[PDB]
Each structure stands twice: as C-alpha cells, then as structure tokens.
Design a protein around this ligand. Structure first.
Ligand code: GTP
Ligand code: MG
Lengths: 124, 188
C-alpha cells in the first residue's frame, strides 16, 4: 500500500532527529511497523530495511518498506527527502556542536508526507 | 578541557551526554562517530568543559580513544548497571585498556566509573560493580595476552593506581545525574 512504512533520520552521533511510522503513530520500531503494515493487513510480505548516508553533515536515513521491486521509487523518495532535509535544516546540521541538533526543532512531518504523497504518483 | 565518555555499546553514553546538555530525554541509535559540545559547569565560576561522546562499538572504540586521549582532562567510563552481570568480562577488558592508556599519559586524566541505568530494578550497585571489576582486572593482568596494574604480588584494587578513580551511580532516564554533575563540576 504505502510506499514506505518506516523512516527515520538520525545523526551519526546517534541522535534521532525525526522519524515517521504512519500518519497513525510516532515511530515505535520496524517490528511494529511490520506487524501493522503487513501482518494485520491480510507467502506474505517482508520489510526491507536499508540506509543512506550523508557524510558531509553526518546523517543516516533508514527506511523500511515492502516489495523489493519498488526499490527505485523508494530510493528516489530518500534522495528527495535528503535534499530537502539538508536544505531546510542546513543551519542546524552543518555546525559541529551537538547542541545545534539538540536545540533544533525538526518538524519535518508535513514536508515528508508531501514528498511521500508526491512520490506515490510518480509510481503510477 | 575535554571529558571523554567511553563504555560498551548501550551503556548509555549518548543519553547521559544529552541529559547533561539539555536536561531532556531523546531517542538514540548506536553511535558511529563521536559527538561533542560545550558544558557550562554548575559551580560559581561556571567553567566550561568539552564533553565528547565516543562510540562504544569494538571497531571504533580504541581508534577514537587514541585520537582524543591526549586532550582529556577526565574520562567517564559508563557502565550499564542492569546488564553488568552478563557483561562483566567485556567491561573489565575495555576498562583495562582505558586504565593503561590513561596512565601512559603525561598528565593522567581523572577517571570516573559511572554505574548507569540505576532506575532499573535489577541494577547492581556501584559498590558491587567496583568489587567485581577489581576481582576481574586482577585476573586479566595475569591472563592478558611495560605498564602494569598495581603490584604483581598484591590482589588488584583501584586505589593502588597512580590515578584519581571514582565510582558513582546515575540514571539517564527527568533523570538522576546529580552526583555526575557534581563530579564534573569538581574536576572542571
Ligand atoms: N532505563 C534506562 N535506560 C537508559 C539509561 N541510559 C541509556 N538508556 C537507554 O539505553 C539505550 C542505549 O543508550 P545510548 O545512550 O544510545 O547508548 P550508548 O552508550 O551511547 O551506545 P553506543 O552508541 O552504541 O556506544 C537507549 O535506548 C537509552 O535510552 C538509563 O540510565 N536507564
Ligand atoms: Mg552512543
């Protein structure tokens, strides 16, 4: 159904900055995402968990999705999310001090749903 | 100067780091690089220390401790007090290298053993952790495959070390880090 069922963005330092897990909740983990998105929705699907890095600003993007063959669309969603995130929050992320990430508010939900809703059209 | 937070994966280094800098909780994932930030101490003069959180993963722990050790005014070795019983050997083995590294330094950094995760019921006390770590380092200095620990002829104890070494208890989950901020203040 949904292009991605799990998405989290954290610093390489280990700080979770923002995460998505349905317009239903606020990230409780890949396992619950597999239970809610696959098990309670019907071989059966699996959840592929992959990551993408931003080495310049030390970021990790982890995404969990169904249907390995949609990988190209998921990868584009990641790239679009990455580009926007790094522009919208460049100030908070280019700094060296962790306080910069700790004091930033990463209210990315809305920009993400937009990019998600928008990527689910390119697939069709 | 710098205060290095080191310890096995999941001991709570990053959460303590966050709690000290913001007083808040934040979700975290296994760290893959170091992170640093300025900490204004609780005392009158309000000195500033540079907290440096070091990844606990085996593939990165020493590479990064080596890189930052000469800049350390103090080292906080974090211990998961609730998982201590099963992890003792891994803890002692890493602490061993930390003790050695610290002594081989011109101006030995002050060292704290923060027995974290006290908020969990099954958590071993700092007193018991000190006792089991001494007993364990005592065997390691013999089995360990020249700087050495204490005196060969007497059972190992932290007091025999040419280093300031303290133990305290804490919890990153508000949290209970009063003693830790007190110690950090004291060594600033
Ligand atoms: N109950 C409890 N949980 C804690 C405490 N400190 C950390 N945790 C939790 O333990 C987990 C690991 O803590 P981290 O701070 O990310 O661990 P770390 O030592 O930085 O781990 P590495 O980056 O792998 O070296 C997280 O889910 C924390 O929220 C504590 O005092 N009490
Ligand atoms: Mg960490």
């Amino acid at each position: 159904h949904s292009m991605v069922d799990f998405f989290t963005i954290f610093s390489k330092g280990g700080l979770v900055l923002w995460c998505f897990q349905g317009v239903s909740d606020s990230c409780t983990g890949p396992v619950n995402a597999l239970i809610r998105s696959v098990l309670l929705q019907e071989t059966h699907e699996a959840l592929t968990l992959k990551y993408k890095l931003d080495n310049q600003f030390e970021l990790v993007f982890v995404v969990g999705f169904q249907k390995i063959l949609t990988l190209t669309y998921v990868d584009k969603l990641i790239d679009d999310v990455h580009r926007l995130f790094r522009d919208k929050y460049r100030t908070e992320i280019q700094q060296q001090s962790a306080l910069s990430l700790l004091n930033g508010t990463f209210d990315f939900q809305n920009d993400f749903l937009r990019l998600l809703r928008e990527a689910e059209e390119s697939s069709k | 100067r710098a205060v290095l937070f080191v310890g096995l994966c999941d001991s709570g280094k990053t959460l303590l780091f966050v709690r000290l800098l913001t007083g808040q909780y934040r979700d975290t994932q296994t760290s893959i690089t170091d992170s640093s930030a300025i900490y204004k101490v609780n005392n009158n003069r309000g000195n500033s220390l540079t907290l440096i959180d070091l990844p606990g993963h085996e593939s990165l722990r020493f590479q990064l401790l080596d890189r930052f050790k000469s800049s350390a005014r103090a080292v906080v070795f974090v211990v998961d007090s609730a998982a201590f019983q099963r992890e003792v050997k891994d803890v002692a083995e890493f602490l061993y290298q930390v003790l050695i590294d610290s002594m081989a330094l011109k101006n030995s950094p002050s060292l704290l053993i923060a027995c974290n995760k006290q908020d969990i019921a099954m958590a071993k006390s700092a007193k018991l952790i000190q006792q089991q770590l001494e007993k364990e380092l005592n065997t390691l200095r013999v089995t360990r495959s020249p700087a050495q620990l204490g005196k060969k002829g007497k059972e190992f104890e932290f007091s025999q070390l040419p280093l300031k070494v303290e133990f305290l208890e804490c919890s990153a989950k508000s949290a209970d880090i009063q003693d830790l901020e007190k110690w950090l203040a004291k060594i600033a």
